[PDB]
């Protein structure tokens, strides 16, 4: 109940532009009645089918040959980290051995487990397979809130769909919420702003469009220089309050020495191999 | 064995054995496996050489009975570890013999096979300077109902009896219930239990 | 942003050999090192410090971002800044995104993305 609460939650918010996927459920315990009032209140955008996602059948039932992604939630809060991670590599095992190429988003909790899946063959992380390894990406805002504190706290914000809330109080919440109500967004600019920089086309965009950027489309480049001029065909990692608001980066024309130092890939310092001792 | 001397030292037409033992899983029984592969009726020269991958626990909980056999060898790591079997020159096997201790220990019947199929796909997904899909490979499975993760070509389904799945078919899988028509067989012809035996 | 970079090329070394080993240094390493790295920054020294009591976030986005190549994405403020009392609490709050007419006061920080030198 929780669990598709909260999915249903984020996936259906009004923050989005029109989206019409249909979220169809696939799962092994028949719903309780909080769960099958939860499946009435979205009865036009959601559907449930009783099934195990490791039989074929169920798979072919689901129509997972031609769904555009397959979601795997996981417990969080599991007794066995271990097990948790087992029976989500086996399921992601089933759908892959059915659908070879059917993108998969999954949860794991461990980063071993994660290594240990992506060596199945036809796990494809350009296709758009994505492992969200919860302890990975939470160790990781932990230490980007050691080089800024309350960074974790900023990027979190980032991904939950929210609405504006508003009060009569002058409190710390007010400008608090004012700021949640912005998510991080994704889509293509003007030609009218093609040939410029990106300092140039960030001033621009602020607030006389009313949208930040932090990146554009030597892919993923964070936060550009100076010297980087705006390719045509481009898409801006924008901040904005919705996705119907960044419409307007399209809409607009005019309208106003032998030593290893580092890595293999020169990205992180490295040092000899330390004996325990040495460091207690 | 270590990661050194196993890569320096270049192997070919071996057999490479991967065990997933523990301090606690039961005995497998190694012995009546490495005895047919050092039969006498094979020239010294003929004989294929044999290295274990598993749990340095485990491998030290059943040495004790494998001894008195030449061209063995232990490494003590994970048959999951690509940098191990890149040194174990897995391409270049007459077999790799995937093999699990912890099947009865635990009541799942989905985690059972689940580190054997893991460890199969792996030895699959690897790129050789040719592909790890060639490879010659035997996985022991102990529900028969696991064996449609082994291959993706194939078509799957669960009312297909195991010897008419294709993996099965292929010798690429083996499971323990093909041989419960032995007691029949026995029970008919008591010379054949001693003909399959020899 | 989180890890610090992880390209295709650790994904796969990761993946391999499960340690990361050193290299010796390059000119595709040295150029590997120019990306942005997350900062704070004071409010009450350097070059931002004109804008004082009354400034607009507006002002200091556009200045940041014309002369730094810096860009703010939002304010680090003290819970109890917005209060007349003065009070000893040290506590702050992350204000994301505010506007051009967002109000500055001087005992501020500012979360950012910054060159490398
Ligand atoms: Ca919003
Ligand atoms: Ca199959
Ligand atoms: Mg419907």
């Known amino acids: ?73 996981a417990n969080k809060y599991c007794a066995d980290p271990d097990a948790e991670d087992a029976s989500n590599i086996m399921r992601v095992i089933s759908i892959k051995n059915y659908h070879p190429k059917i993108r998969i988003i999954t949860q794991m909790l461990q ?44 990027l979190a914000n980032l991904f939950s769909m929210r609405s504006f809330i508003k009060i009569e109080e002058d409190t710390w919440q007010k400008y608090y919420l004012e700021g949640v109500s912005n998510e991080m967004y994704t889509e293509y600019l003007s030609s009218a702003f093609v040939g410029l920089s990106f300092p140039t086309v960030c001033e621009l965009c602020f607030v006389k469009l009313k949208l930040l950027m932090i990146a554009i489309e030597s892919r993923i480049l964070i936060n550009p220089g100076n010297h980087l001029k705006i390719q045509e065909g481009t898409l801006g990692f924008f901040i904005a309050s919705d996705a119907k608001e960044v419409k307007r980066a399209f809409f607009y024309c005019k309208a106003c020495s032998n030593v290893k130092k580092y890595d293999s890939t020169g990205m992180f310092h490295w040092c000899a191999p330390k004996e325990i001792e040495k460091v207690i | 064995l270590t990661r050194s001397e196993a890569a320096m030292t270049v192997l070919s037409g071996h057999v490479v054995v991967c065990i997933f033992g523990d301090v606690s899983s039961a005995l497998i029984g190694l012995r009546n496996l490495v005895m047919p592969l050092r039969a006498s009726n094979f020239h010294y020269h003929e004989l294929k050489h ?14 004790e009975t494998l001894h008195n056999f030449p061209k063995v060898s232990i490494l003590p790591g994970t048959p999951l570890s690509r940098a191990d079997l890149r040194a174990v020159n897995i391409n ?21 096979d689940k580190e054997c199929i893991l460890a199969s796909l792996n030895i699959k997904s690897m790129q050789f300077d ?62 054949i239990l001693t003909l399959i035996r020899t | 942003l989180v890890t610090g970079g992880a390209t ?19 000119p595709q390493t040295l150029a590997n090192r120019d990306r942005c790295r997350v900062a704070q920054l004071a409010l009450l020294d350097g070059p931002f410090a004109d804008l004082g009591d009354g400034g607009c976030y507006g002002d200091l986005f556009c200045k940041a971002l014309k002369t730094y190549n810096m860009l703010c994405f939002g304010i680090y403020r003290l819970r109890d800044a917005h209060l007349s009392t ?20 001087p005992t501020d920080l500012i979360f950012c993305l910054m060159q490398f030198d």
């Open chain 2, 92 to 112: 270049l096997c007459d077999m790799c013999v995937i093999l699990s201790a912890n099947q009865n220990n635990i009541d799942d019947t989905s985690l059972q």
């Open chain 2, 130 to 191: 040719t592909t790890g899909v060639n490879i010659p490979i035997i996985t022991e499975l102990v529900n028969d109902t696991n064996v449609q993760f082994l291959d993706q070509d194939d078509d799957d389904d669960p009312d297909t009896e195991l010897y008419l799945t294709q993996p099965f078919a292929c010798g690429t899988a083996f499971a323990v219930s093909v041989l419960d028509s032995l007691m029949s067989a026995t029970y008919f012809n008591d010379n």
């Open chain 3, 86 to 105: 003065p009070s000893q609490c040290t506590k702050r709050y992350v204000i994301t995104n505010p506007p051009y007419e967002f109000e500055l006061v």
């Open chain 1, 111 to 154: 980063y071993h487990n994660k290594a240990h899946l992506l060596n199945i063959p036809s796990w494809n992380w350009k296709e758009g397979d994505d492992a969200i390894c919860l302890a990975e990406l939470k160790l990781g805002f932990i230490a980007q809130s050691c080089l800024a504190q309350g960074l974790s706290t900023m």
């Open chain 1, 1 to 73: 109940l929780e669990s598709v609460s909260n999915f249903l939650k984020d996936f259906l918010h009004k923050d989005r532009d029109d989206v019409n996927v249909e979220i169809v459920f696939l799962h092994n315990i028949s719903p309780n009645l909080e769960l099958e009032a939860l499946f009435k209140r979205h009865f036009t955008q959601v559907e449930f089918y009783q099934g195990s996602v490791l039989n074929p059948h169920d798979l072919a039932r689901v129509k997972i040959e031609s769904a555009d992604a397959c979601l795997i939630l």
């Open chain 2, 50 to 63: 044999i290295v274990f991958v598993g749990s340095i626990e485990y491998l030290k909980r059943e040495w």
């Open chain 3, 8 to 26: 295709p090329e650790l994904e796969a070394l990761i993946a391999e050999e499960n340690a990361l080993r050193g290299g010796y240094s390059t």
